[PDB]
Design a binder for these strands. Structure first.
Ligand SMILES: *C(=O)c1cnc2ccccc2n1
Ligand SMILES: *C(=O)c1cnc2ccccc2n1
Lengths: 10, 8
DNA sequence: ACGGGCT
DNA sequence: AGCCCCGT
């Protein structure tokens, strides 16, 4: 995910 | 059809 | 019939 | 390490 914790999604 | 990781 | 990107 | 998920 994120960045951070790319996306989702992208 | 969606593109979120592949985009077909 | 389809796998992707940075904090 | 990850509110990781999606339709035409
Ligand atoms: C696009 O709308 C779409 C929907 N379902 C799929 C299933 C498998 C491969 C690609 C697909 N694309
Ligand atoms: C993109 O490569 C990708 C892969 N797996 C998925 C699962 C559920 C929703 C979206 C997805 N996208």
């Amino acid at each position: 995910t994120x960045p951070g914790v790319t996306x989702p999604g992208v | 059809x969606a593109x979120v990781x592949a985009x077909v």
